[PDB]
RNA sequence: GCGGGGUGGAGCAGCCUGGUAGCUCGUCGGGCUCAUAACCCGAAGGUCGUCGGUUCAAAUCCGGCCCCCGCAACCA
RNA sequence: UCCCCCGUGCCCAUAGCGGCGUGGAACCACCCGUUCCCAUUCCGAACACGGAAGUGAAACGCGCCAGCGCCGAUGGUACUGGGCGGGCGACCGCCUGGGAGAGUAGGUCGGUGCGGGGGA
RNA sequence: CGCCUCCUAAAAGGUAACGGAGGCGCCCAAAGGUCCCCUCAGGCGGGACGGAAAUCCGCCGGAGAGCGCAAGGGUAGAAGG
RNA sequence: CUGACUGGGGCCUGUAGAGCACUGAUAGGGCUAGGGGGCCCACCAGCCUACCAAACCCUGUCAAACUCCGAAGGGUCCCAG
C-alpha cells in the first residue's frame, strides 16, 4: 500500500451486549456492541422474540361455546 | 397442403397462404408428395408455424420453427373506404442537415 | 423567389501523384489524401496533413495488407 | 478483442520497427528472460540469447545481465553493433533493464 | 394516400427510366397479378385509386397487395414564373415503375374476381399492363 | 444505537428518555426501571455499561417495539382495508373511522383544506 | 500473511462442503472470493458542499483503506451535474482486509441494522455475485454516533470465482450471509 | 483573433528585444506568458515575457 | 417577395445575452355593507402555435409546416 | 529431415463466434510471498520484484463438430468499350470484344518463414 | 458576391446553372512537445437515498462512441482518456 | 524519334449494373415494450384486443447527397511499333 494515506490495522476487542467477544482487526483496538450474530432473534435458529402468535385470532375467539344448539 | 377450412374464414377472412413448402433435409429416397397442414382450427388472425409442422418419416425440419407459415387476416371491406379517405396525411418531414441531423 | 443554397469549395486535386513502377526522387510527393487511405511504408513520410511523400531516389510500389490498411513503398534504385 | 497486454505490445513494437533498426526484442517469463535480435526485413531471428539456453543460475535479475553481456558477445561476433531495445510489453524496469545494461557493457549500440 | 413519413432529403433529381426492372418481378403473395408492361412515375393518386377500386369490386372480402410505393418527390414550379429561381416544389409523390414488375396482387378470390379488378385497376394506370396468376416459375424463386 | 434501536436522549432522566422510543409510553418506562430496579431520576449519560444491557434487555424481550409493532399495526389495517369492513372503506376513502362528523373539522385525517 | 477467522473458516470448513455438494475436480474449481468492492454514490455533495473527506475518513475508517474518488462520466440537467464533478468514493478490497471486513460485516453490521430480517435471496447476479445495500454507516463498530453529521450508506458488491447463482450462494451462506428466503 | 483573445509579444527577458509573436487569451491567462525560447541575440535560450503589442 | 409576430381567460413583458416565466385586469375563496359595486386580505391557472434539430439543459438558438400584422408587387 | 512447446514474423476471417475434448516431464501460465527495485487518482487487480509447495481450474497451445460468421465456382443474366439499326418519344434491338452483383453447387473449425528448448 | 464540406460530376484530375444541402469570419497556455500508462457507445443482470439517465459489480459488445465547432475522410495496433 | 494512335505490363478509381451490411425509406406477416379500447378493480395487480404501434425476425422493395459488392472503360508510368 501507500503510506500516509492508510488508517493502520491492528488486533481488535469487538465486545457484545450478551459476553459476545470477537477476535478480529479493526481501526480501533477496542469497541462495545448493542447486538450480535450470537444473539439476535432472526439469528439465532428462529427464537421468535415477544410474539410466538400465531396470530392469534382468528378462530380463536372461542368466548364461548355457551351459545346455545 | 392446408387441409380445412379455417374459421377465421367462414367469419369473412382470408387464409394468407406465407409459405406453400417448406425447407427440408432428407434423404432422395425419402421424397413426400407433401405435408399436410391443420388450418381448420385457424381465427383472425390465428396462425400456424413451422413449430406446428407435423412431419412424415425421415425428414428433418431445414428453418427455424419461428417462421411463420399460414395466416387468417381481414379481408377488404367497402365500409373501411369512409375511413380511408377521411384519415388524414400529412406533409413529409426532413430530415436534417448541419446544426440539424 | 431565392436560393438559401448557391455555394460549394474549391476543389483540392487530391488522389495519387506517383504510381507503382515509377521512378521517383526524394521529396518526391506520392500521394495526397484526407486521412490515412494509404499509410507510410518503408522509405515513405507522411506530412501533417497525411501527404506521402519519398524519403529516398528510387521506384514507387504499392501493398494490399488486408485489415491493415494500403502501404506505400519506394524501393531503392 | 485485445487486451492491453496485446496494445502495449503492438504499440511500443510499432514505433521500434519504423526507425528500422536491427531489434533486440526480449522475452521476460516467471522464470527465465530470452533475447533474440531480428531483422523485420526479411523477417529473420539474426542471433539469440536465453537464460534456458545458458542455464543459468538464481537470481533473476542478475541472471538478465548476464543474458545480456552474453547477447551482445556473439553478437559483436556477427557484426552487429547498431540495434534497437524492443521492451515489448515490459517497463523498462528490473530484469528487462538490466539485461539491456548487459547488452550495453557488452558493447552492443543503443 | 401513401406517401413517406419522413425522408433525409426534400427534393430528388429526376434520373430515367432506361432497362426492366430491377426486381419486383415475380408474384409473392396473393395468387393473381397486376404487371407493367411500359415504363412510368406512377402517382399515388393513381395507386389509390387503382387500390379503391379493387376494393370496391370485392365488396366484402379478398386481401389487396401493393408492391409498389411512391417515394420519389415530384416537383413543380407555380404557375407561370420564368426559368431559374431555385428548384420547384415538392407537390405529389411517384412510384418509378420499369416493365415488368407487380404492382398489386390479389388473394382470397375466385378467378374471375380477380381477372375483372385487376382489369378494372388496369384502366386507372397510366401504362398498359398483363395480368398474371402464380406459377411455379414464381414459386421458384 | 442503544435501546432498542434507537438512541434515546442523553442529558433526559432515564424514564423519560424511554419514550423517545415508538412502544413504550410513561408507564412502560417506570415499568421497566421497576423490574431492573434502576433510578427513574438519573440522566442516561450516566447509566452503567451493566445498566444499560439489563435495562436494554428487558425492554426489547417484553414488548414489541419500533420496526415490528408498526409492522403488525399495518398488518391489522392491511386486513381490515382488506376484508371489506366498515372500518376498511373508511382507511381505503381515508376518511375518519370512529363516528366523527365530517361536515366540518376531520381535518387530521382529510388533510389541509382543498377549497372549491 | 494474517490468520484470521473468515479466511480460516473458508478453506477448512466452506471448502471441504463446497466440494461435497458439487464435486468439483480440481482444487481451482472450487468457489473462492476475489474482491468486496465498496462505493458510495454519493453525489449530494455534487455542489452544496463537495468536502467528502469526513465520508473517505469514514470508509477509511470502516475498511482500513482509503478509498478513490469516483467523478462524472457525463455532464446532466436534471441532476445538476458537471461532467468531471466529485459525486461519490470507491474503495476495492482484495485479500486480508476483504475478509477482515467481511469478519465484521456478517458479525456484527448486518446485526446492528434497523429491523434486518436476512440478506435478499434474489440479489445475485446470475453469474455468481452478490451486491447489497446499506442506509446507513453507523451500521459498522467503528463509527460511533458522536464523528458523524449526516447519514450516508453504500454499496457492497462481492465477487466470486464461481459460474452459477448457486455455488455462489452455498460459498456465501457457508461464510455466514443470512438469507430470509 | 479578438477582443478578449488578443495578440502579443515575447520580448526576451535580458537583452530587451521581442523574437517571438503570438496570442493568448486574456481571461483565460490574465497573467503575463512566461516562456523560455532562442534568442538570437544572446544566441541561447531566455526566459521571454510577454509585452504589449 | 422582404420585415415583424403566436406566452394562464383578455391584453402585454421575458427571446437579443439558453438554466430563473413577470405586469394590469379578470376568475375563485374570505372581509366591509341590509345588499351590490368599489375597496381590503388570500389563492388558482401558461407546460410558451406546432413537428424536427443543436445542447448537459431550449419560451430563448437553428430548420420545417401552420395562422396573424405591416410593407412591396414597377417599365407593361 | 519429423514431432511438441516458447519466441517473433508473413498471408489478413478458408485464420472467426459457439460447443466438445486434450496437454503440465519440458516450456508457458496461473501460483507462493510483498523484504528489496518498482507500483495503485483506493487495491501487489495492473505494473514490479524475490520465489517454486500446488494446478492445468483461468489463460494459452493442440484436436474434433459446419448452428452462426467467413470464403465461393460453372452456367446464365445485367451492364458496357467499339461498330450498326428502330421509335414521336419514354425508350428498344442486332454485331464484335469485355463482363458483373445476387443466387446455386460447394469450401472452411487455418497455412507458412526464421531463431530457440525438448524428444526420436 | 470571399472561404470549407457533400452531391450533381458521366470510377484519374477538372467541370456549369438564380441546381440540391450545410457550415466559416473562431478557438486552445493546453485542446501544445514528449515519455508512460489506459480503451469506447450500447445491451442484459445485480446495487441504500437513486430516477430512462449520477456512482458501483459482472457478462456480452471491432467500433455503432470519442476526436471543441459543418461535413467528409480518417482513426482504439489511437488521432480517443 | 522523343508525337497523335496502337501492343504488352504494372499501379490508380467507385460510375453502369446490382445489393440492403451501414444512413434513411418501405408493403405485408410473425413476435412483442408502450399507449388507446373492452371486462374487473382502488387494496394493486390481472385478462381480452378484426386498435394505433418501438425494437427484433421473416417475406418483399426504394435512394444524387446509402454501399457488403462492383464492371466495361478511363488516367498515369515502363518497354515496343
Ligand atoms: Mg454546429
Ligand atoms: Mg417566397
Ligand atoms: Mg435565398
Ligand atoms: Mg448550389
Ligand atoms: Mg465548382
Ligand atoms: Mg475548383
Ligand atoms: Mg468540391
Ligand atoms: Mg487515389
Ligand atoms: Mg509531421
Ligand atoms: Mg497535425
Ligand atoms: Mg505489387
Ligand atoms: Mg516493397
Ligand atoms: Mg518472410
Ligand atoms: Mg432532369
Ligand atoms: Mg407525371
Ligand atoms: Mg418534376
Ligand atoms: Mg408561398
Ligand atoms: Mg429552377
Ligand atoms: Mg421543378
Ligand atoms: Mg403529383
Ligand atoms: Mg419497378
Ligand atoms: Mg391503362
Ligand atoms: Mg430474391
Ligand atoms: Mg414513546
Ligand atoms: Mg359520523
Ligand atoms: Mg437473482
Ligand atoms: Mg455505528
Ligand atoms: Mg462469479
Ligand atoms: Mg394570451
Ligand atoms: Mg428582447
Ligand atoms: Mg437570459
Ligand atoms: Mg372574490
Ligand atoms: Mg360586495
Ligand atoms: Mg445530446
Ligand atoms: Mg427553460
Ligand atoms: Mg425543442
Ligand atoms: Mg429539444
Ligand atoms: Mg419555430
Ligand atoms: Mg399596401
Ligand atoms: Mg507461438
Ligand atoms: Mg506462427
Ligand atoms: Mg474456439
Ligand atoms: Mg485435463
Ligand atoms: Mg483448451
Ligand atoms: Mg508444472
Ligand atoms: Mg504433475
Ligand atoms: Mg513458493
Ligand atoms: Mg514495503
Ligand atoms: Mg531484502
Ligand atoms: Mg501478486
Ligand atoms: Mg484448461
Ligand atoms: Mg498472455
Ligand atoms: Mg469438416
Ligand atoms: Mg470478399
Ligand atoms: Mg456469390
Ligand atoms: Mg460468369
Ligand atoms: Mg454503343
Ligand atoms: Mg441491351
Ligand atoms: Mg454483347
Ligand atoms: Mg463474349
Ligand atoms: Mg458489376
Ligand atoms: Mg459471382
Ligand atoms: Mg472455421
Ligand atoms: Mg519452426
Ligand atoms: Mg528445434
Ligand atoms: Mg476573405
Ligand atoms: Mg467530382
Ligand atoms: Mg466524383
Ligand atoms: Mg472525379
Ligand atoms: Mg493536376
Ligand atoms: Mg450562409
Ligand atoms: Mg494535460
Ligand atoms: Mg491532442
Ligand atoms: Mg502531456
Ligand atoms: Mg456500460
Ligand atoms: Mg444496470
Ligand atoms: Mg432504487
Ligand atoms: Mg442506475
Ligand atoms: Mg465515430
Ligand atoms: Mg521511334
Ligand atoms: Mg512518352
Ligand atoms: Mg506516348
Ligand atoms: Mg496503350
Ligand atoms: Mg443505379
Ligand atoms: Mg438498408
Ligand atoms: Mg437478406
Ligand atoms: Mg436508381
Ligand atoms: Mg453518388
Ligand atoms: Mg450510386
Ligand atoms: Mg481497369
Ligand atoms: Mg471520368
Ligand atoms: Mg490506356
Ligand atoms: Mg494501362
Ligand atoms: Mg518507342
Ligand atoms: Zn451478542
Ligand atoms: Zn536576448
Redesign the pocket.
Given at each position: 500500500?501507500?503510506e500516509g494515506?492508510?488508517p493502520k490495522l491492528v488486533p481488535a476487542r469487538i465486545i457484545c451486549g450478551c459476553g459476545n467477544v470477537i477476535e478480529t482487526y479493526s481501526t480501533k483496538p477496542e469497541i462495545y456492541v448493542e447486538v450480535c450474530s450470537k444473539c439476535h432473534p432472526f439469528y439465532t435458529g428462529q427464537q421468535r422474540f415477544v410474539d410466538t402468535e400465531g396470530r392469534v385470532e382468528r378462530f380463536q375467539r372461542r368466548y364461548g361455546d355457551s351459545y346455545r344448539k | 397442403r392446408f387441409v380445412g377450412t379455417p374459421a377465421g374464414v367462414r367469419?369473412?377472412?382470408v387464409l394468407?397462404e406465407?409459405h406453400r413448402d417448406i425447407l427440408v433435409k432428407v434423404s432422395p429416397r425419402n421424397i413426400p408428395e407433401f405435408i399436410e397442414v391443420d388450418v381448420s382450427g385457424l381465427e383472425?388472425?390465428?396462425?400456424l408455424?413451422a413449430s406446428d409442422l407435423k412431419l412424415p418419416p425421415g425428414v428433418e425440419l431445414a428453418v427455424?420453427p419461428?417462421?411463420?407459415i399460414a395466416?387468417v387476416?381481414?379481408?377488404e371491406?367497402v365500409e373501411k373506404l369512409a375511413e380511408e379517405a377521411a384519415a388524414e396525411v400529412a406533409?413529409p418531414?426532413?430530415?436534417?442537415?448541419?446544426?440539424?441531423? | 423567389?431565392?436560393?438559401?443554397?448557391?455555394?460549394?469549395?474549391?476543389?483540392?486535386?487530391?488522389?495519387?501523384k506517383?504510381?507503382?513502377?515509377?521512378?521517383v526522387r526524394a521529396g518526391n510527393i506520392l500521394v495526397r489524401?484526407?486521412?490515412?487511405?494509404?499509410?507510410p511504408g518503408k522509405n515513405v513520410g507522411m506530412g501533417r496533413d497525411?501527404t506521402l511523400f519519398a524519403l529516398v531516389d528510387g521506384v514507387?510500389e504499392?501493398?494490399?495488407?488486408?485489415?491493415?490498411?494500403?502501404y506505400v513503398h519506394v524501393r531503392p534504385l | 478483442?485485445?487486451?492491453?497486454?496485446?496494445?502495449?505490445?503492438?504499440?511500443?513494437?510499432?514505433?521500434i520497427?519504423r526507425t528500422g533498426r536491427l531489434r533486440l526484442?526480449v522475452?521476460?517469463?516467471?522464470?527465465?528472460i530470452?533475447a533474440?535480435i531480428?531483422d523485420?526485413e526479411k523477417?529473420?531471428?539474426?542471433?539469440?540469447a536465453?537464460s534456458?539456453?545458458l542455464k543459468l543460475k538464481?537470481?533473476?535479475?542478475?541472471?538478465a545481465r548476464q543474458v545480456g553481456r552474453a547477447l551482445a558477445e556473439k553478437a559483436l561476433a556477427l557484426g552487429i553493433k547498431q540495434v534497437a531495445f524492443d521492451?515489448?510489453?515490459?517497463?523498462?524496469?528490473?530484469?528487462?533493464?538490466?539485461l539491456a545494461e548487459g547488452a550495453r557493457e557488452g558493447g552492443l549500440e543503443f | 394516400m401513401?406517401?413517406?413519413?419522413?425522408?433525409?432529403?426534400?427534393?430528388?433529381?429526376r434520373?430515367?427510366?432506361?432497362?426492366?426492372?430491377?426486381?419486383?418481378?415475380?408474384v409473392?403473395?396473393g395468387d393473381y397479378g397486376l404487371v407493367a408492361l411500359?415504363?412510368?412515375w406512377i402517382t399515388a393518386q393513381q395507386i389509390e385509386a387503382a387500390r379503391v377500386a379493387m376494393v370496391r369490386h370485392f365488396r366484402r372480402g379478398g386481401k389487396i397487395?401493393?408492391?409498389?410505393?411512391p417515394?420519389?418527390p415530384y416537383t413543380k414550379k407555380?404557375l407561370e414564373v420564368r426559368?431559374?429561381?431555385?428548384?420547384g416544389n415538392v407537390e405529389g409523390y411517384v412510384a418509378?415503375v420499369?416493365?415488368g414488375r407487380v404492382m398489386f396482387e390479389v388473394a382470397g378470390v375466385t378467378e374471375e374476381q380477380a381477372m375483372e379488378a385487376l382489369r378494372i385497376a388496369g384502366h386507372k394506370l397510366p401504362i398498359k399492363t398483363k395480368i398474371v396468376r402464380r406459377d411455379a416459375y414464381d414459386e421458384a424463386? | 444505537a442503544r435501546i432498542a434501536g434507537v438512541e434515546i436522549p442523553r442529558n433526559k432522566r432515564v424514564d423519560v428518555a424511554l419514550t423517545y422510543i415508538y412502544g413504550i409510553g410513561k408507564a412502560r418506562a417506570k415499568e421497566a426501571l421497576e423490574k431492573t430496579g434502576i433510578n427513574p431520576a438519573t440522566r442516561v449519560k450516566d447509566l452503567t455499561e451493566a445498566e444499560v444491557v439489563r435495562l436494554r434487555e428487558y425492554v426489547e424481550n417484553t414488548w414489541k417495539l419500533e420496526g415490528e409493532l408498526r409492522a403488525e399495526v399495518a398488518a391489522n389495517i392491511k386486513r381490515l382495508?382488506?376484508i371489506?369492513c366498515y372500518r376498511?372503506?373508511r382507511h381505503?376513502?381515508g376518511l375518519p373511522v370512529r363516528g366523527q362528523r365530517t361536515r366540518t373539522n376531520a381535518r387530521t385525517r382529510k388533510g389541509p383544506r382543498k377549497?372549491? | 500473511?494474517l490468520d484470521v477467522a473468515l479466511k480460516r473458516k473458508y478453506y477448512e470448513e466452506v471448502r471441504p462442503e463446497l466440494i461435497r455438494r458439487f464435486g468439483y475436480?480440481?482444487?481451482?474449481?472450487v468457489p473462492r472470493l476475489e474482491?468486496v468492492?465498496?462505493?458510495?454514490?454519493?453525489?449530494?455533495a455534487?455542489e452544496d458542499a463537495r468536502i467528502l473527506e469526513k465520508a473517505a475518513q469514514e470508509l477509511a475508517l470502516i475498511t482500513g483503506?482509503?478509498?478513490?474518488?469516483?467523478?462524472?462520466?457525463?455532464?446532466?440537467?436534471?441532476?445538476?451535474?458537471?461532467?468531471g464533478m466529485?459525486?461519490?468514493?470507491?474503495?476495492?478490497?482484495?485479500?486480508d482486509?476483504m475478509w477482515i471486513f467481511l469478519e465484521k460485516l456478517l458479525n456484527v453490521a448486518l446485526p446492528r441494522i434497523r429491523d434486518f430480517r436476512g440478506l435478499?435471496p434474489?440479489?445475485?447476479?446470475?453469474?455468481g455475485?452478490?451486491?447489497?445495500?446499506?442506509?446507513?454507516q453507523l451500521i459498522f463498530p467503528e463509527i460511533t454516533y458522536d464523528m458523524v453529521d449526516a447519514?450516508?450508506?453504500?454499496?457492497?458488491?462481492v465477487?466470486t470465482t464461481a459460474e452459477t447463482d448457486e455455488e455462489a450462494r452455498a460459498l456465501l451462506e457457508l461464510l455466514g450471509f443470512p438469507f430470509r428466503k | 483573433?479578438?477582443?478578449?483573445?488578443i495578440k502579443?509579444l515575447l520580448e526576451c527577458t535580458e537583452c530587451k528585444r521581442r523574437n517571438y509573436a503570438?496570442?493568448?487569451?486574456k481571461?483565460?491567462?490574465p497573467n503575463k506568458?512566461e516562456?523560455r525560447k532562442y534568442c538570437p541575440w544572446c544566441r541561447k535560450h531566455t526566459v521571454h515575457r510577454e509585452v504589449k503589442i
Amino acid at each position: 500500500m501507500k503510506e500516509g494515506i492508510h488508517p493502520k490495522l491492528v488486533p481488535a476487542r469487538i465486545i457484545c451486549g450478551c459476553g459476545n467477544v470477537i477476535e478480529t482487526y479493526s481501526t480501533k483496538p477496542e469497541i462495545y456492541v448493542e447486538v450480535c450474530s450470537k444473539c439476535h432473534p432472526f439469528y439465532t435458529g428462529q427464537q421468535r422474540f415477544v410474539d410466538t402468535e400465531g396470530r392469534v385470532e382468528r378462530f380463536q375467539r372461542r368466548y364461548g361455546d355457551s351459545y346455545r344448539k | 397442403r392446408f387441409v380445412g377450412t379455417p374459421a377465421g374464414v367462414r367469419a369473412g377472412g382470408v387464409l394468407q397462404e406465407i409459405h406453400r413448402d417448406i425447407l427440408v433435409k432428407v434423404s432422395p429416397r425419402n421424397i413426400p408428395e407433401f405435408i399436410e397442414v391443420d388450418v381448420s382450427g385457424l381465427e383472425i388472425g390465428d396462425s400456424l408455424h413451422a413449430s406446428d409442422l407435423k412431419l412424415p418419416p425421415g425428414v428433418e425440419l431445414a428453418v427455424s420453427p419461428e417462421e411463420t407459415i399460414a395466416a387468417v387476416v381481414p379481408p377488404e371491406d367497402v365500409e373501411k373506404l369512409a375511413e380511408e379517405a377521411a384519415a388524414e396525411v400529412a406533409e413529409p418531414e426532413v430530415i436534417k442537415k448541419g446544426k440539424e441531423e | 423567389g431565392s436560393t438559401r443554397n448557391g455555394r460549394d469549395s474549391q476543389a483540392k486535386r487530391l488522389g495519387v501523384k506517383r504510381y507503382e513502377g515509377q521512378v521517383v526522387r526524394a521529396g518526391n510527393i506520392l500521394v495526397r489524401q484526407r486521412g490515412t487511405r494509404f499509410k507510410p511504408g518503408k522509405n515513405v513520410g507522411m506530412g501533417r496533413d497525411f501527404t506521402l511523400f519519398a524519403l529516398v531516389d528510387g521506384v514507387v510500389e504499392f501493398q494490399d495488407r488486408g485489415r491493415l490498411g494500403r502501404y506505400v513503398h519506394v524501393r531503392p534504385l | 478483442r485485445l487486451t492491453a497486454y496485446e496494445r502495449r505490445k503492438f504499440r511500443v513494437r510499432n514505433r521500434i520497427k519504423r526507425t528500422g533498426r536491427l531489434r533486440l526484442s526480449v522475452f521476460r517469463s516467471l522464470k527465465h528472460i530470452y533475447a533474440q535480435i531480428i531483422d523485420d526485413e526479411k523477417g529473420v531471428t539474426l542471433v539469440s540469447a536465453s537464460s534456458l539456453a545458458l542455464k543459468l543460475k538464481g537470481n533473476k535479475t542478475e541472471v538478465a545481465r548476464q543474458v545480456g553481456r552474453a547477447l551482445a558477445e556473439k553478437a559483436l561476433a556477427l557484426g552487429i553493433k547498431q540495434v534497437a531495445f524492443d521492451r515489448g510489453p515490459y517497463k523498462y524496469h528490473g530484469r528487462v533493464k538490466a539485461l539491456a545494461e548487459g547488452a550495453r557493457e557488452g558493447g552492443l549500440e543503443f | 394516400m401513401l406517401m413517406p413519413r419522413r425522408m433525409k432529403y426534400r427534393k430528388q433529381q429526376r434520373g430515367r427510366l432506361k432497362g426492366a426492372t430491377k426486381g419486383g418481378d415475380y408474384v409473392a403473395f396473393g395468387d393473381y397479378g397486376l404487371v407493367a408492361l411500359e415504363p412510368a412515375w406512377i402517382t399515388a393518386q393513381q395507386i389509390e385509386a387503382a387500390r379503391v377500386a379493387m376494393v370496391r369490386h370485392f365488396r366484402r372480402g379478398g386481401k389487396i397487395f401493393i408492391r409498389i410505393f411512391p417515394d420519389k418527390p415530384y416537383t413543380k414550379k407555380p404557375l407561370e414564373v420564368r426559368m431559374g429561381k431555385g428548384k420547384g416544389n415538392v407537390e405529389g409523390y411517384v412510384a418509378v415503375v420499369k416493365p415488368g414488375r407487380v404492382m398489386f396482387e390479389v388473394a382470397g378470390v375466385t378467378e374471375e374476381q380477380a381477372m375483372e379488378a385487376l382489369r378494372i385497376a388496369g384502366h386507372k394506370l397510366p401504362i398498359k399492363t398483363k395480368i398474371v396468376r402464380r406459377d411455379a416459375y414464381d414459386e421458384a424463386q | 444505537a442503544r435501546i432498542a434501536g434507537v438512541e434515546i436522549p442523553r442529558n433526559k432522566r432515564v424514564d423519560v428518555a424511554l419514550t423517545y422510543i415508538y412502544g413504550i409510553g410513561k408507564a412502560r418506562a417506570k415499568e421497566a426501571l421497576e423490574k431492573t430496579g434502576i433510578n427513574p431520576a438519573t440522566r442516561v449519560k450516566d447509566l452503567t455499561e451493566a445498566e444499560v444491557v439489563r435495562l436494554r434487555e428487558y425492554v426489547e424481550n417484553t414488548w414489541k417495539l419500533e420496526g415490528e409493532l408498526r409492522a403488525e399495526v399495518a398488518a391489522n389495517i392491511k386486513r381490515l382495508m382488506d376484508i371489506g369492513c366498515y372500518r376498511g372503506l373508511r382507511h381505503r376513502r381515508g376518511l375518519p373511522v370512529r363516528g366523527q362528523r365530517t361536515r366540518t373539522n376531520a381535518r387530521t385525517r382529510k388533510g389541509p383544506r382543498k377549497t372549491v | 500473511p494474517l490468520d484470521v477467522a473468515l479466511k480460516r473458516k473458508y478453506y477448512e470448513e466452506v471448502r471441504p462442503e463446497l466440494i461435497r455438494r458439487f464435486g468439483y475436480q480440481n482444487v481451482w474449481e472450487v468457489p473462492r472470493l476475489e474482491k468486496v468492492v465498496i462505493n458510495q454514490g454519493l453525489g449530494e455533495a455534487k455542489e452544496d458542499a463537495r468536502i467528502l473527506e469526513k465520508a473517505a475518513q469514514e470508509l477509511a475508517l470502516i475498511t482500513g483503506q482509503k478509498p478513490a474518488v469516483t467523478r462524472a462520466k457525463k455532464s446532466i440537467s436534471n441532476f445538476k451535474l458537471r461532467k468531471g464533478m466529485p459525486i461519490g468514493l470507491r474503495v476495492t478490497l482484495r485479500r486480508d482486509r476483504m475478509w477482515i471486513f467481511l469478519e465484521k460485516l456478517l458479525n456484527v453490521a448486518l446485526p446492528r441494522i434497523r429491523d434486518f430480517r436476512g440478506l435478499n435471496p434474489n440479489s445475485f447476479d446470475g453469474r455468481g455475485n452478490y451486491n447489497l445495500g446499506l442506509r446507513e454507516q453507523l451500521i459498522f463498530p467503528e463509527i460511533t454516533y458522536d464523528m458523524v453529521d449526516a447519514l450516508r450508506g453504500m454499496d457492497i458488491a462481492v465477487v466470486t470465482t464461481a459460474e452459477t447463482d448457486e455455488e455462489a450462494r452455498a460459498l456465501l451462506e457457508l461464510l455466514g450471509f443470512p438469507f430470509r428466503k | 483573433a479578438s477582443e478578449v483573445r488578443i495578440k502579443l509579444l515575447l520580448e526576451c527577458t535580458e537583452c530587451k528585444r521581442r523574437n517571438y509573436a503570438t496570442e493568448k487569451n486574456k481571461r483565460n491567462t490574465p497573467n503575463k506568458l512566461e516562456l523560455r525560447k532562442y534568442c538570437p541575440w544572446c544566441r541561447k535560450h531566455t526566459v521571454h515575457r510577454e509585452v504589449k503589442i
